[PDB]
Amino acid sequence: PPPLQAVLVADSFDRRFFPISKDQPRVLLPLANVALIDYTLEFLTATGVQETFVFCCWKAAQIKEHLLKSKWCRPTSLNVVRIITSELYRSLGDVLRDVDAKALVRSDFLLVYGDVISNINITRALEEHRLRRKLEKNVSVMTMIFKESSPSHPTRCHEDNVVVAVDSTTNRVLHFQKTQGLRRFAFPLSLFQGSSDGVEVRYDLLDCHISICSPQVAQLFTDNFDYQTRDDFVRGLLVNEEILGNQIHMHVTAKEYGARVSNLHMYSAVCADVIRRWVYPLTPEANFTDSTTQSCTHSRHNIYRGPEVSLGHGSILEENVL
Amino acid sequence: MDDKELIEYFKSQMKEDPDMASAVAAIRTLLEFLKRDKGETIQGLRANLTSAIETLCGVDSSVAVSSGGELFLRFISLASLEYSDYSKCKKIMIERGELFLRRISLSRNKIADLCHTFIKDGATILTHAYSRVVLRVLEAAVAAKKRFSVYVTESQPDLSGKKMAKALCHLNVPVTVVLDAAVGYIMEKADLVIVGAEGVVENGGIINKIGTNQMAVCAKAQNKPFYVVAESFKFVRLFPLNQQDVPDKFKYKADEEHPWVDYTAPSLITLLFTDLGVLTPSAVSDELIKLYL
16 A cells, blocks of 8 residues: 655636735635645645645745745654745646656645645545556546535535536546536537446536546646646546546545635635534634644634634624634 | 720721721731730630630621631641740741731632633623622633623612622623612523622531522522632531521621521532632532531
8 A cells, every 4th residue: 555645736727816816826815814725735634645745836935935834844744745836837737747757656646726625534435446446457547526515505606516427336427517607518428328327417516626646647648738727637538538548437425525715706605614614623723733823712603712802892793703 | 915906906907908808807817916925825825716706706797707717726726736835836826827818818819710711701790799709700800801791789788789880890891780689680681690608608508698598599590500709718617507597696797677698508509619629519518627627
């Protein structure tokens, strides 16, 4: 059982937090008075990750000088960050070409975007994915991680849903598709040609990017410059399935949270969410990052309180007020 | 020191600073008296101290005085004496009494630092009288930036509740003086009721100002947890069982009428506060037989 690498981008290439991103990048935004990089790193620490090859492309000096105030910088914690600042790479295709060039990862690197909020214990899905590998000659590639939700949860800014046809018996993906405007849903019958035993379309799924990977993901990306996002990677892999098909695999867990604040609205959602304990352990007063500027004392209706508040006479704190 | 110097010194100790409990003044006056020895014989000394306690209670029969004086006699002669000369012994006794009075001076602030962790945010404290202990614990609760309101009952005979309301709005805390009869009305909106004992018998109850029993039994009716603060020089040795079982030497205090102080059983009390810590009223029995030795 080799170690568990985990690459980690540190700014979305399509920058959506404009204009506010110009001051500081998203991965330095205060989600609940905490840096999103701290959330995702606490997550990788929870899963069991030893190394987080944090890649940076923008404001990387600020990110470096802040992440050196972490708990992962010092060798106390096991999850040893290894920052990498650059400006030559511009996309996640470019990130993974960078990886295969530097020849870093052995296998199974938890490709995880910058501001993923979650508490997922991937070790189950990861075990099943490594099983798929060890059993069928490393054909399976990107065992993604999806989470159930209803389509109307405020955590779904319509710009970010998904539609995915999966072969529910081996739970592999047969067709991925965004839906940022398609009031219809197209499907090539070849998926049923591929599904000689019963496909299943799903739309309740919600994406988390926590996708597992392989050295094969890099060996793929290095061939095709045209890639610009892991989604285009999915589509390209889903059209050229003639030789060494490398079928993606969906994998879903129910009890845990997951997201990626990639606008102001989904940020409002995940903030008013993590305030309501929805993601425990990674709550706001457990102070997983043990910085004394963020201690807090629970109360009725989750009205938190940090040191030296001194509320005035009559301030009716109703709920969720960090 | 034929006991008129005694009482005049006690009244001086009173009017110099009225706020403090009568009993700490009693112990201070007994200590000063002990300094005015005129004779080193252990026996005639403790007989003198007992006569002194008697002539003290003859003017301030508040259970405080007797409890404190008896505890004083208990703690003076704790260690050995080997009175081969009886004068160095009296030096040791003055020293030990001074240590005792230091512990009594630390009582209040110990109460303050142990208790105010119990007034949760946004509550409505209820009290009954000018319990300087409750005043200082309330101060050490507000100055910790807690938030609450406070009701107080005027306690008709001497309107002590009103004086406390004055000295509490002087602390800028929202305070309302409700009639003493209305302890049932308010008992539902006020979360917990704090009151300051002036006597803590063996079973665990208290012997406090007239309007306490009804308050305890109401705040046990509507299940509002009770709390009584009581410092370690008010651990009496009585044991009433009814109202008629508090001796007349404690009730009227005067020398178709009214009593002054009365009982409250250790079931109507949830947690007692001493500078020995926080106790459940059975701890009163254990720690009292262990304190009186």
